[PDB]
Each structure stands twice: as structure tokens, then as C-alpha cells.
Amino acid sequence: CELCCNPACAGC
Numbered sequence: 001c002e003l004c005c006n007p008a009c010a011g012c
Contacts, residue, residue: 001009 001012004012006012
């Protein structure tokens with residue numbers, strides 16, 4: 001998620 005590997009991650 002720090003890398004926005006899925007849309008559900010915050011900020012992504």
C-alpha cells in the first residue's frame with residue numbers, strides 16, 4: 001500500500 005499496489009490502499 002505504500003506503493004499504491006491496490007486502489008483500496010489509503011491515498012490511492
